Design a protein around this ligand. Structure first.
Ligand SMILES: *[C@@H]1O[C@H](CO)[C@@H](O)[C@H](O)[C@H]1NC(C)=O
Lengths: 50, 99, 49
């Protein structure tokens, strides 16, 4: 504990994400909506908009 | 106002022991990178050492004005080098004040 | 748990000691790196070995 500020211990957690190529298994909190067809609508399929 | 300058020449420089010598955070370089200092090499290296206040550490940069940067220590615009700064509360601080 | 001088080595495209012999990140790495000080939990006056 008497060391300098650059010699102190540091706990490191690295979160490593991979982009979606398989079906998504982990997704954040977002309420789903019933699917509509044959209309110009905004969609959100697994995180990509349009 | 009376900073020392040391000429480093005719030797082999290992930059990995700098982290062991002093407990600093950032090896903030400008013209080079800290990880590529051991491959390529230079003509001469000069080391300038001084003590300032924590407010004026940001003034040690190329192209910047202030109080230290105008009247005490001015860096050129074509500065190629690294600035190493770390806290010195355990050696350069007294309860009665430093003069 | 690493030292404070080598937190910057956990980044894509870095060398040194941790990034070459201990823990290397890819160049096209997507993700987040979280680091915080743990002097209270991971240090001893006699030395944490
Ligand atoms: C600095 O030099 C003194 C005198 O040789 C020595 O006692 C001390 O351990 C040195 N500090 C470091 C960090 O090596």
């Amino acid at each position: 504990p008497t060391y300098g500020v650059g010699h102190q211990p540091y706990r490191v957690v690295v979160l490593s994400f991979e982009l979606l190529h398989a079906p998504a298994t982990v997704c954040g909190p977002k309420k789903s909506t019933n699917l509509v067809k044959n209309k110009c609508v905004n969609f959100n399929f697994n995180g990509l908009t349009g | 106002y009376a900073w020392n300058r040391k000429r480093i020449s005719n030797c082999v420089a290992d930059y990995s022991v700098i982290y062991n010598f002093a407990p600093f955070f950032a090896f903030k370089c400008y013209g080079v990178s800290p990880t590529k200092l051991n491959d390529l090499c230079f003509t001469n290296v000069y080391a300038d050492s001084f003590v300032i206040r924590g407010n004026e550490v940001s003034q040690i940069a190329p192209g910047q004005t202030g109080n230290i940067a105008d009247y005490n220590y001015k860096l050129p615009d074509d500065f190629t080098g690294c600035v190493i700064a770390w806290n010195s509360n355990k050696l350069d601080s007294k309860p009665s004040g430093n003069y």
